[PDB]
Amino acid sequence: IANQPVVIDNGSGVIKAGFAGDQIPKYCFPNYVGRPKHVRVMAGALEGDIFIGPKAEEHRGLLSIRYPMEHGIVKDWNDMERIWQYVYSKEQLQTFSEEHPVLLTEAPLNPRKNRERAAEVFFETFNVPALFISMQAVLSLYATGRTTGVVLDSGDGVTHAVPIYEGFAMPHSIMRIDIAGRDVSRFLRLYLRKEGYDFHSSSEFEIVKAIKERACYLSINPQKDETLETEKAQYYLPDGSTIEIGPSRFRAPELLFRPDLIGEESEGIHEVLVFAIQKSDMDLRRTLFSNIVLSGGSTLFKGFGDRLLSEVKKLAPKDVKIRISAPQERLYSTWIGGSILASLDTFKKMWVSKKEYEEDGARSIHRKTF
Amino acid sequence: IANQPVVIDNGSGVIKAGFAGDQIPKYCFPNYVGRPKHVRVMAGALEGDIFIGPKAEEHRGLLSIRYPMEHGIVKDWNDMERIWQYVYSKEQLQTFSEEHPVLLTEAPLNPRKNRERAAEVFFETFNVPALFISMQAVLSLYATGRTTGVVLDSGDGVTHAVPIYEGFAMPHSIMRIDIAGRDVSRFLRLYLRKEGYDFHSSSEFEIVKAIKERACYLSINPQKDETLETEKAQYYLPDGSTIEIGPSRFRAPELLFRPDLIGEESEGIHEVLVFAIQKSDMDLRRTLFSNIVLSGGSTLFKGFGDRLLSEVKKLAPKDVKIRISAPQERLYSTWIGGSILASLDTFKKMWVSKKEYEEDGARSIHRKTF
Amino acid sequence: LKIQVHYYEDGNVQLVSHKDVQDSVTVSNEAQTAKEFIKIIEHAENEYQTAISENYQTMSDTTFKALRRQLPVTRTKIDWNKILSYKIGK
């Protein structure tokens, strides 16, 4: 049973899906489960009472949105099962789970219990013929067409700098933080309350994400922007009322570089990138500096790459050629790589078959990934 | 010019005033500006047509009362200027604003524009020599004598939990809601309409507050009280007519613990207290649980502390010593600490002088507070 | 069972270790005694490496942090202006 395999690229913020050997993921939607706050009085209302994807985006105000996955670690397993069921259902894929092999993705260095429980869901609840979990950095390099280079990424949950050199993903040199787009959105929400405009509701939380996506920019010199007084630019909400954003827009994405502002000890994106290069061998450092690939949604801030280049110039040894490259479609970089990896004839060897899982168990899944 | 400084402890419901070094605030009155509804035909009437303090409390029925403050955030600035002018006037303090330095208070995580506009009023309209703005939680611990511990408060506007450890108010663990005494009084009013007795007028609203102050208890088990049938205890209004209150008295203060009743997905008092301790560090949690201080008027319900203990037992980790301490004068706990802070010699270093404000501006006020 | 690692770039770091083990085994066969002792070594040296790798990556990070923390008890970078114009105590 070697049908066209499916590539479900997981993520805390957004979840991508579709078939192998494709240019773009056809099925992209945000990873959450909306449920109705209000009392459904009238007959002929929205049926089901568990909303995922575009229906939930259309009917935000009704639904109490909650995310199942934080920092690449699922909290609510029943919610992720409903999301995966919605992916396979007629509203999105129009396929059965029994036909196609599965390509899953996860952030590196996660708890193994969650990886085991993920496999249990795919093999038992769904009747998958073969499963395969993989890295995000390895796929992003397959999407670009390079083998050597570091992959800095920044989704909604995790930020991790994985160094790879000619098909050798060093498991030891992988740096990681639990600081990312969701924490930046939460930090921007806190700043908007300091400005004046309070947002506490779960449906109203996605307006803060929309403001973060649209009206934000990362300054090169933060001390210079602190001394100067801001212009206070405007933005229209979904309702109609205008909001002067003020200094919150530029101080919000500083969290990624300065993790002390939220109140939690971490390295930072720029430190993690330097740190992933340093932990590798001495001969391979200069090739890793030359090939730095960006990925994820939280790398799309204005003057983000320029700030990363300046931070590398400050920390790294002098007289070294720095190059932070990036693809055009930074959001769909990991999925394209999975679609390429799935289309290859080698893919049959790497996967965990259902028969092999039934015989061995979790140990076979731990062996095949690394 | 280092005269005996004035401590104006601002509050949404009640405002406290007096001089530094005293045991109690001598001048306490409700924070609103009453203005006459009816037309004045006869001579020898109440002159001025702007009523603040005991005159407004005496003659409620005449006056269309409106509060300038809402959730620790002044909406009507002209009304607060008139209140502050009334505080300093001969009817209350019998002093000039030119002589004495001013200690002011505000809730945490408020609009910075309101803090600037507060400072502008005190420095320009009044001619203050030196101003200082402070938190409520820091002062309450100064009043008790402790340094470490959490301060849960529940005024008329804001409920906020701030954890402090050895004279270090933790900014990133500050939890806050806009659910408080005024929202409980508003929720009680809505319940009394469901019972039968409506109170639509603004002068008539203070009858609902008086009912809330006297006849409201917090039951330990809400599901058990819902299944049982109430006794329907009586209450006499200022007119003389009887009111059978019924189940509205015990379901009214449930708003603070269950904010889903008003139609506003918030945490609640007990969750805010747990969240403030959890956001702070692992080493400080057990000391923060042992030192929990209560303040504000909406902590004075019958069986409030007993319910808050039971909710902490439900949420917090097991086998940990819980202690919710409470002073005798909870309404004046924040003012007592300000009077103590003002009496100390180090208060001279902390304040913002008039000369320093004229040179720098708002930036110096933002620096000195934190 | 003694490990030793030494890194000397930009300054030194050393790993030094040992585990003393006392065990009682019962002799039976040549095939069994050959595969029994090896089994004792295999499990001990794995448990050792496991602890040596997995405890130190996490527990050293927390014990090395219990000595000096990465950020203060407030989790805020200390304000120097605050330090130079604030008073504590009673």
UniProtKB/Swiss-Prot annotation, chains A, B:
- A Pfam family that this protein carries is Actin
Q: Do you know which PROSITE patterns this protein is assigned to?
A: ACTINS_ACT_LIKE
Q: Which domain of life is it from?
A: Eukaryota
Keyword check for Nucleotide-binding, yes or no. Answer: yes
Main localisation: cytoplasm
Bilayer-spanning residue ranges? none
SMART domains from the xrefs?
ACTIN
A single GO CC term for this protein reads: centrosome
Q: What does this protein do?
A: Part of the ACTR1A/ACTB filament around which the dynactin complex is built. The dynactin multiprotein complex activates the molecular motor dynein for ultra-processive transport along microtubules.
Subunit field text: Part of the ACTR1A/ACTB filament around which the dynactin complex is built. The filament contains 8 copies of ACTR1A and 1 ACTB. Interacts with dynein and adapters such as BICD2. Interacts with BCCIP (isoform 2/alpha).
Give the protein name, as stated in the record. Alpha-centractin
Organism per entry: Sus scrofa
Q: What is the lineage of its organism?
A: Eukaryota, Metazoa, Chordata, Craniata, Vertebrata
Curated annotation (Swiss-Prot), chain C:
Q: Which domain of life is it from?
A: Eukaryota
Compartmental location: Cytoplasm, Cytoskeleton
Main role?
F-actin-capping proteins bind in a Ca(2+)-independent manner to the fast growing ends of actin filaments (barbed end) thereby blocking the exchange of subunits at these ends. Unlike other capping proteins (such as gelsolin and severin), these proteins do not sever actin filaments. May play a role in the formation of epithelial cell junctions. Forms, with CAPZB, the barbed end of the fast growing ends of actin filaments in the dynactin complex and stabilizes dynactin structure.
Instruction: Give the similarity note.
Output: Belongs to the F-actin-capping protein alpha subunit family.
Q: How does it assemble?
A: Component of the F-actin capping complex, composed of a heterodimer of an alpha and a beta subunit. Subunit of dynactin, a multiprotein complex part of a tripartite complex with dynein and a adapter, such as BICDL1, BICD2 or HOOK3. The dynactin complex is built around ACTR1A/ACTB filament and consists of an actin-related filament composed of a shoulder domain, a pointed end and a barbed end. Its length is defined by its flexible shoulder domain. The soulder is composed of 2 DCTN1 subunits, 4 DCTN2 and 2 DCTN3.
Q: What is this protein called?
A: F-actin-capping protein subunit alpha-1
Identify the gene encoding this protein.
Answer: CAPZA1
